[PDB]
Every structure is written in C-alpha cells, then in structure tokens.
Design a protein around this ligand. Structure first.
Ligand code: HEM
Ligand code: SPK
Length: 384
C-alpha cells in the first residue's frame, strides 16, 4: 500500500581516481539502497541505477530492457557523446543483435580461443625476449601490455600483420576489413574474419554490419592492456600477491578471475538500457521509457555474493563475477581476455628476474578523463 518515495537524484561528476582506488561516490550509492537515481556529466536528465548482484543480473538479462531505445534521446551519460549511433552491436536488440553475435560466437568461446593459445604464447615470448635484451628500465605497458593484445586479436581475426598502427592511432581499418570480409566471404575458415565473411555471404548479416563488429573486436584489446595493467600494478605494489602466484602457479587461473572481479575496470557506468514496459525492482516502479544503468563494479563487491568483497582472495570459492557483463550483451572477449591474462602472468612473473616497480606505487600514472581505467605507463625494473 504505502507509497515509497523515489530516491533523490545523485549527481556523479567526472573525477580522476588514483590507481585502482574505489569511487567514493559509487560507494555512497551502494550504501543508499538497491535502487538509486543518477545524473552524469553529459546527456540530459536522470537514470536509474542498480548496484546489487541480483538486480544487475536481472536488468542485463531481462528482455524487457532494450538498447535500441537509448538512441531515441539524450540519456544522461559519462561520455561526451554517443557517436556509435546505430549499427554498433552495443546499440542493437535481439533481432539484429543476435544475428551479429551469433556470426562470431564460436571463435570466442572457451574452446574457440584455445585455438590461438600456442601462437599467442610464442608471440608473448618474443615481446619479453626483446624487453629482456634491451635491459631493465622498461615501461611494461609499451613493451608488452599494449602490443600483446593486438598481436593476439590479429591471430584470432585471421589477419596477417601491420594493422597495429591504425589501432594505436585510434586513440582506414573500416575499409581494410570491408575488403577482407567482403572479398573472401564464403570460405569455411575458422578465424573471425572468415566467419563474418561467410555470414555476409549467407545474407545472415550485412557487409557494413560485419565491418563494424570487426573493428570493435580488433581494437577491444586495449581493454586487456588497461585491465592487465591494473593487474600488474597490484601484483607489484602488493608483493604477497605476486609471491603467491610464483609459489602456487596452479592457482593462477582462479587468481586471475579474482583480480578481474576486484579491479575497477571503468569510471562510473557505461551504456544504459531502456525499460520497454513497466518493471518492478525491489519495490521501485521503473516506468517504460526510463533509462536504467547497472554497475558491474558495484555488483562485484556485493557483500552477500562475495563475502569480504574488498579483499583479494585467490582462493575465493563461488566467484560469479560480472566483470565481462551479463545477459545478451556480455563481453565476447571475456574468454580471450582470460587467456591473454593467463599467458601474461606466466611470462611476466616467470621470466623477469627481480621484477618490481621502478617508481613508488602512487607515482604510476593512470589515465585521466577516461572511460576505461588503467595505467598510462607501468615503469618496471629488474636484474639484468
Ligand atoms: C579484461 C578485459 C575486458 C573487460 C573487463 C571487458 C568488459 C566488458 C563489459 C563490462 C562490457 C559491457 C556489457 C554490457 O553491455 O552490459 C563489454 C562489452 C563488449 N566487449 Fe569487452 N571487455 C574486455 C575485453 C574485450 C576484448 C579483448 C574485446 C574484443 C575481442 C571485447 C569486446 C567487447 C564487445 C564487442 C562488447 C559489446 C558486446 C555487445 O554489446 O553485444 N572486450 N566488455
Ligand atoms: N622506488 C623504486 C625504485 C627502485 N630502484 C631499484 C634499483 C634496483 C634494481 N634492481 C632490482 C632487483 C630487485 N632485487
């Protein structure tokens, strides 16, 4: 019966957070209740926000919330603008979205990404070989964390090599993939570009649709560069973590998933969803048309799902984190990201004698005015 007053609209200004420190404003919101309302720097008005693990899964996996409708107005957001108007996989719903994700799904499953494990391991060794030959002072990001993800995706996409330059500038290729995809599009290849090529041939997807997806995947590696950057900043600044991984290599896969759960991958929240019809969440009525954001970072610190949520526990048993999202729009690169992280931890922790930061932890530069958090550089040193 009794009316439940709507939450006050909380303003969430863009703030550059140090290292991997948690956003105090998000903490405030997490403590206010499961359903809040926020207003970000750009776009207009307010949007709902859910922070609990169960509500985050509900909103991201329920058909009643859509992505296409976000383009119908200026939904309050962190990013200055929403250039990927239409066509981008993130802004598509079940009909078109499903066709697009299905065309390449097989290459990104656990078994799919295992295809490039061997070659990727070798590619990483060449990068580490070079860093070691050059001598101790090194920016781990520039020498390994940045180039490795790019090399890996090229192998998975089924592209030869030199596409990196364009990738770094993206900080051209649209035309490149248009060629490869639309000029080979029917081979039974297993690589991503072949799969897309084939799909386009079977009228499953459009050439433009295929190119757009190809571009997102090709440059999605920076996410691993930034995230793994935080992983190593943590492993080096907190030696007990690195020493446990050197002491018990068997725990590396689980440790990596725990690091992925904890690391605050982005600033604020990303892309909202629109309630296509009225929806009830924890006694709150979300009206059709309202925007609803989910915070995967907050969800990953849910005290019920992850007891002692702020502690990094490599032995954490049930670890259903949502760092790669949830629902239909869940990250296609999640399995590939775990593979890259696994190879990186192996190489960095086993092949660099006496590895440590070349500066105080607080002196490592992190990206400012960014959407995805991470170091701009990670200076390290070791015994030559
Ligand atoms: C540890 C590194 C990564 C993290 C933490 C991460 C995280 C995320 C998250 C949280 C989303 C949003 C899900 C949503 O909309 O609810 C997402 C989407 C996406 N990610 Fe990643 N990602 C990572 C690496 C990658 C890589 C390497 C690629 C490229 C192979 C990639 C490609 C994508 C794409 C294409 C989407 C959009 C999916 C869709 O809307 O259907 N991600 N990612
Ligand atoms: N504030 C960090 C600066 C560290 N400078 C270290 C010079 C020594 C390099 N050898 C490191 C091997 C570790 N046992």
């Amino acid at each position: 019966t009794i009316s439940q007053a709507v939450p006050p609209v909380r303003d969430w200004p863009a703030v550059d957070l140090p290292g991997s420190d948690f956003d105090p404003v998000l903490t405030e919101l997490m403590r206010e209740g499961p359903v809040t309302r926020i207003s970000l720097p750009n776009g207009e008005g307010w949007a709902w926000l859910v922070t609990r693990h169960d509500d985050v899964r509900l909103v991201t996996n329920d058909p009643r919330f859509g992505r296409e409708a976000v383009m119908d107005r200026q939904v309050t957001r962190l990013a200055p603008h929403f250039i990927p108007a239409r066509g981008a996989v993130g802004f598509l719903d079940p009909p078109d979205h499903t066709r697009l994700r299905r065309s390449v799904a097989a290459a990104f499953t656990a078994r799919g990404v295992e295809r490039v494990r061997e070659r990727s391991r070798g590619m990483l060794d060449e990068l580490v070989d070079a860093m070691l030959r050059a001598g101790p002072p090194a920016d781990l990001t520039e020498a390994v964390l940045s180039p490795f993800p790019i090399a890996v995706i090229c192998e998975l996409m089924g592209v030869p090599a030199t596409d990196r330059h364009s990738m770094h500038t993206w900080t051209e290729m649209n035309a490149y993939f248009s060629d490869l995809i639309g000029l080979r599009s029917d081979s039974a290849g297993e690589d991503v570009t072949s799969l897309l090529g084939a799909a386009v041939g079977r009228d499953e997807i459009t050439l433009s649709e295929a190119v757009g997806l190809a571009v997102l995947l090709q440059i999605g590696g920076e996410a691993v560069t930034n995230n793994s950057g935080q992983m190593f900043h943590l492993l080096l600044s907190r030696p007990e973590l690195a020493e446990r991984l050197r002491s018990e290599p068997e725990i590396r896969p689980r440790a990596i998933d725990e690091l992925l759960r904890w690391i605050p991958h982005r600033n604020a929240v990303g892309l909202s969803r629109i309630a296509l019809e009225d929806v009830e969440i924890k006694g709150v009525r979300i009206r059709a048309g309202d925007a609803v954001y989910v915070s995967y970072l907050a969800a990953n610190r849910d005290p019920e799902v992850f007891p002692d949520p702020d502690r990094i526990d490599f032995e954490r048993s049930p670890n259903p984190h949502v760092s790669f999202g949830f629902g239909p729009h869940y990250c296609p690169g999640g399995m590939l990201a775990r593979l890259e992280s696994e190879l990186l931890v192996d190489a960095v922790l086993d092949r660099v004698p006496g590895l440590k930061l070349a500066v105080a932890p607080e002196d490592v530069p992190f990206k400012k005015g960014a959407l995805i958090r991470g170091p701009e550089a990670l200076p390290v040193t070791w015994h030559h």
